[PDB]
Structure 1
Amino acid sequence: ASSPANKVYQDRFESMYSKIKDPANGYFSEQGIPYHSIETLMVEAPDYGHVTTSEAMSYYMWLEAMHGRFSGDFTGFDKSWSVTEQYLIPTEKDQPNTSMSRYDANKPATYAPEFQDPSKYPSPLDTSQPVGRDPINSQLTSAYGTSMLYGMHWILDVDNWYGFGARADGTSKPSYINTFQRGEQESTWETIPQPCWDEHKFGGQYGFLDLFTKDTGTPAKQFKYTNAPDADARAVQATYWADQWAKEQGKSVSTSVGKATKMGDYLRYSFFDKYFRKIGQPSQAGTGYDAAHYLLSWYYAWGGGIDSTWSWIIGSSHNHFGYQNPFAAWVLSTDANFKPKSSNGASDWAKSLDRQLEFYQWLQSAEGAIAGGATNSWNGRYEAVPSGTSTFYGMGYVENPVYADPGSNTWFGMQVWSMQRVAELYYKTGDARAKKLLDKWAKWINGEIKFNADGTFQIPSTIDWEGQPDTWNPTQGYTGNANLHVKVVNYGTDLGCASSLANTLTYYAAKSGDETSRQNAQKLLDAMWNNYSDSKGISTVEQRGDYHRFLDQEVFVPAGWTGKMPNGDVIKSGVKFIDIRSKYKQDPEWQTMVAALQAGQVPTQRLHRFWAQSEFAVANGVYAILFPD
């Protein structure tokens, strides 16, 4: 039987759950897939509100699991995994085994450089450049009897708003699409949405392929998928709690635990350098695990031919602290129920856990906030690391990993999302490394939470950095990083980040006894509940400072290249963001947004982001369980 939970906060969870699953509120599509946000005029990570992400699915799993904990009904949780496997994990039709089985573990992919500006793309493929060996593919095909990968593609066009359809039919929904392809300077506003399954039916003469990659011959028809490691790890994290809570009530989610374990087995592809180069010696091709940094990199991707049989898989050289998940690693390496079927699954995750906690500590600033990360591929072309640059196992420190527009580590959210996982690990194991990290971090953030007299509040929103950490010496440990500093540029009231912050503080407080963390966590939850509720959950008015890019952001297109989006929009040099997404002009909020830009004002919105709403719900649940009195 489950332990008693605080009545007050349990009801707040059940209330939020009802608002989120309420058909009338519109958080889900008719197929049961959750949208990024109710509102459609949305550009921040995905560039359309009703486009979904693997991140949303993982939050959908977390939400339903907590629901199982209070209702004894886990059918919703099992349903979230069904929808996921059905719509976000490419099926046999989407990633044909005929092509995947032609994969060569000794030659995973063909090298192609990365550029610091979108106008340098397409990037030319170079077969002369070295590529290391894939050591885990044999383990996976052996344990699962297939060459297909079991991981979630990160972004989905739920209602086929772009018109690409399923496998080029132009009419089916949902639709597998991708956006980012051209380096650190390609913001959400500078992409060219493209289909994952490219049969050359849309876009240019060869689909969208020659916009990003330049080969010696004709681009072949091909499919490609990209994973968001932090999302798959969160799915494992959520499934673990669902399992625990189910067993406390004599119920079972056995089937879901299996899917999660398999997903976690495949997630190991994020442990490797993009083109499998040795960690700390990027000029050499790896011979196996000497190419594994054992951290959750920005992604891993795979693709293959549609008309001909061949395929490739790549990891990532860039590592951001915000993507790490020490808890998921603890689960997959120590819990017998989540032991991956592959020969080295559990042991690799054991190595990942230790490597991740070292990564966090190495990046902890003098104040307590965690710095960006590191890369094994300087400038994305395996260039010489500038002298004086600090390193972590041979990898150079990077302030804003992967993206610089805006800097990937200028958003406060990465702080709470990632530290919340450390807090869960600390709560469950009392691990000393986690404690040392949370004591300092929690003292920093507790001094940055501002409560106003009228009930509202503010927390860090945008942050900046100065300096770099001292080179990591495993046997030396944390030096204190006196020259690494964080600066809070501005504060705000982001309800998603505030909820995640509450979650983190609650787990930490429950284990450490730190009253300051507990009372701040409760004050946040109470403030949000009392002052920001609406019939759809919670919200607040926020400014959309980048929305002017809707009209003045030019999209780069290679000289001589012309194509059409499914709806007819012409793709050519000179086009702006809106020019290749003309349907946005039919959005209910379009006139209001444009009116504000004309009046020289900053547009404002009252948004209901799915992950934010779920974050608030879960935060209430966690508190009700850890502080039953």
Structure 2
Amino acid sequence: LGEYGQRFMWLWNKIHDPANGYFNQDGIPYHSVETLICEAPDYGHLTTSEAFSYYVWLEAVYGKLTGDWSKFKTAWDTLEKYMIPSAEDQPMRSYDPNKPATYAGEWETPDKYPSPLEFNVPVGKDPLHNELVSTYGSTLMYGMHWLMDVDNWYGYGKRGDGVSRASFINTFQRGPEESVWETVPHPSWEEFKWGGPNGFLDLFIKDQNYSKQWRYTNAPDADARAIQATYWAKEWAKEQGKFNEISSYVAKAAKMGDYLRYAMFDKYFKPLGCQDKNAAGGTGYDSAHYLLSWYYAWGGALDGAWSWKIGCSHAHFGYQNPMAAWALANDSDMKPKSPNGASDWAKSLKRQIEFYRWLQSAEGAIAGGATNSWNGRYEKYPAGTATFYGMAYEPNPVYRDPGSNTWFGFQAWSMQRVAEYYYVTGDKDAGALLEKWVSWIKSVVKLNSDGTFAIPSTLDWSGQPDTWNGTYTGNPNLHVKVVDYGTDLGITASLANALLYYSAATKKYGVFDEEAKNLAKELLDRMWKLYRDEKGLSAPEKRADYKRFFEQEVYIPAGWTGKMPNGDVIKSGVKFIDIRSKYKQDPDWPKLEAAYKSGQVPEFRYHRFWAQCDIAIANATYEILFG
């Protein structure tokens, strides 16, 4: 191994040293080593399907670089055992594909919840269910639930037992203004053992009566990442004559891909462009946007009296993955077993790439995405709204606190997958898209004289794209603005990765963009010079938002009372920390509390698992492509 592959092995070893504490005792990676953190998960020893995806990717690269596929197989084994709900977790009975769910609106503020079920709103047909049951002989949905309480910190345990590790939980339920700070963490398996008389159900959905039930929520970007990772694992293992070793792992990915088509459908299977909650439901694929939406979700009564499935009407460019889509569409090893799996993915591949191109700003950054459900209630679009196969442009799909596309990290994460795609296929549209985004990137990244660097941290947006008609117009009235800069190391690494794939691609298919490679190499080297530490790499970051631990009110309706597993009482007026009193026993709590009582912005040096993974993988990627 060269210099870069050595950097990978160094960080890999830091990640896998059990004294460093990246993984729990079951081998499940945590969101971060440090427990005091709040940003998407609200505690650092939760974990995410995202973390698991990065774990698979990390070990794929380990296989490439060492010839040893045991790390990859173990990563998948743990993913499947713990993060995919098992048969007993998702006992689905009495599903009706002609009636997939009952509609409820999305609402602008958390105080509008619980959202009423509206029983007359028509819901469309689910065209996947029968095919998948016929294909696999099961109602089991093979996809990751997004959020896990790894060491049962919240107390829900496994299927209501209050004690087991790897406890499925959820948070976000109450629309676009429910920040990470404004949620009520609740179990996926609802037995009424906590919360109120109806457990947590009646904070979120208003119904005439309530039953015990389960539900899970997929994060399609993560599942798609895990597929992307697996594609490279099988390419890299075939190069070594080790295909059969990972053969069964490639099949898991192909199956994950098959179920991940639920992410391609409107929430309530309503036709694209309907702009009316009272319109008739779709009859098949007229409700497919063929994008990786923000989620799919599924549920069932513990009875077996009913079950349900939803997609999502909102798509963010940040979620898309042309590399996974291409693999499922075109690579015979990754072909899903269903009749329509691969064809559906080929449609999604092309729709995705058009989506990215439609959202490309005048400068080259990618704008947020689009919705088939304006305001989350199938409203009529404002006059003058730009559209994409009948979906309305949104600058900040799904969330507004903060705006989902104010985070520059989507640029890197998502464009990295397009750069891999372009590297493999030479697709001209993907190349033209990349060339303009790379041009923007070079103009915004700061390489300081003193050897430091900064990348955009927050973005803001103005205007709209032109309505899509199959070709890119330049979007001269759509603008990005860089609001501030930072040293997010996971994102920096991800951007270097994107730039490396793109550069390698231009060498194969056109004029070698050597500057792109050099910028990538500068970022990776300056980072390595500056930010190594005992557990991997970190850079200081200020978290002024952490005032919200103490100050953020969590909406609870007047008159509703319940309890968390540790006895914390849930009622009107409670703050973030009031329903998470165990935070006060965190090792860093005294530090934060003193910083807060004292008027000062706390500062942290985090080891996020995904970031350490992105770092390792980007350094390895230099070796694989250019060494």
Is 1:491 equivalent to 2:482 in the alignment? no
Q: Which residue of 2 aligns with 1:270?
A: 263
Q: Which residue of 2 aligns with 1:343?
A: 339
Distance 2:36 2:615 in 1: 22
| Aligned partner (choices 488, 496, 500) of residue 502 of structure 1 | 496
| Aligned partner (choices 394, 397, 408) of residue 401 of structure 1 | 397
| Aligned partner (choices 360, 379, 389) of residue 375 of structure 2 | 379
Is 1:224 equivalent to 2:220 in the alignment? no
Aligned pairs for 1:71-110 within 5 A: 71-96=66-91, 100-110=92-102
Q: What is the TM-score normalised by the length of structure 1?
A: 0.97
Aligned pairs for 1:352-391 within 5 A: 352-391=348-387
Distance 1:396 1:221 in 2: 37
Q: Which residue of 2 aligns with 1:298?
A: 294
Kindly tell me the number of residue pairs found equivalent between the two proteins.
Answer: 617
SS of the aligned residue for 1:547 comes to helix
The question of whether the paired residues in 2 share the 8 Å contact of 1:108 and 1:313 is answered with yes
Is 1:12 equivalent to 2:7 in the alignment? yes
Aligned pairs for 1:45-444 within 5 A: 45-96=40-91, 100-217=92-209, 219-252=210-243, 253-282=246-275, 283-444=279-440
Q: Which residue of 1 aligns with 2:509?
A: none
- 1:421-458 CA-partner distances (Å, limit 9, x unpaired): 01001101110010010100001011111122332110
Is 1:595 equivalent to 2:574 in the alignment? no
SS of the aligned residue for 2:365 comes to coil
Distance 1:315 1:545 in 2: 35
Letter in 1 for 2:119: T
Q: Which residue of 1 aligns with 2:607?
A: 608
Distance 1:461 1:133 in 2: 41
Letter in 2 for 1:258: A
Is 1:35 equivalent to 2:30 in the alignment? yes
Distance 2:204 2:83 in 1: 23
Distance 1:562 1:285 in 2: 37
Distance 1:371 1:284 in 2: 31
SS of the aligned residue for 2:95 comes to coil
Letter in 1 for 2:403: G
Q: CA deviation at 1:308?
A: 4.1
- 1:110-148 CA-partner distances (Å, limit 9, x unpaired): 001110000000011111110000111111000100011
Distance 1:365 1:284 in 2: 35
Distance 1:429 1:335 in 2: 12
Q: Which residue of 2 aligns with 1:562?
A: 561
SS of the aligned residue for 1:189 comes to coil
Letter in 1 for 2:329: S
> Structure 1: which 5+ residue stretches go unaligned?
none
Name the % identity.
Answer: 66
Distance 2:477 2:280 in 1: 32
SS of the aligned residue for 1:156 comes to strand
4+ runs of 1 displaced by more than 4 Å?
none
Distance 2:617 2:539 in 1: 19
The question of whether the paired residues in 1 share the 8 Å contact of 2:158 and 2:164 is answered with yes
The question of whether the paired residues in 1 share the 8 Å contact of 2:93 and 2:300 is answered with no
Distance 1:618 1:101 in 2: 42
Letter in 1 for 2:405: N
Distance 1:408 1:449 in 2: 21
SS of the aligned residue for 2:544 comes to coil
Letter in 2 for 1:92: A
Aligned pairs for 1:451-490 within 5 A: 451-474=447-470, 477-490=471-484
Q: Which residue of 2 aligns with 1:528?
A: 527
The question of whether the paired residues in 2 share the 8 Å contact of 1:325 and 1:422 is answered with yes
Moved more, 483-492 or 443-452: 443-452
Distance 1:262 1:551 in 2: 44
Letter in 2 for 1:352: S
The question of whether the paired residues in 2 share the 8 Å contact of 1:101 and 1:146 is answered with no
Distance 2:190 2:66 in 1: 44
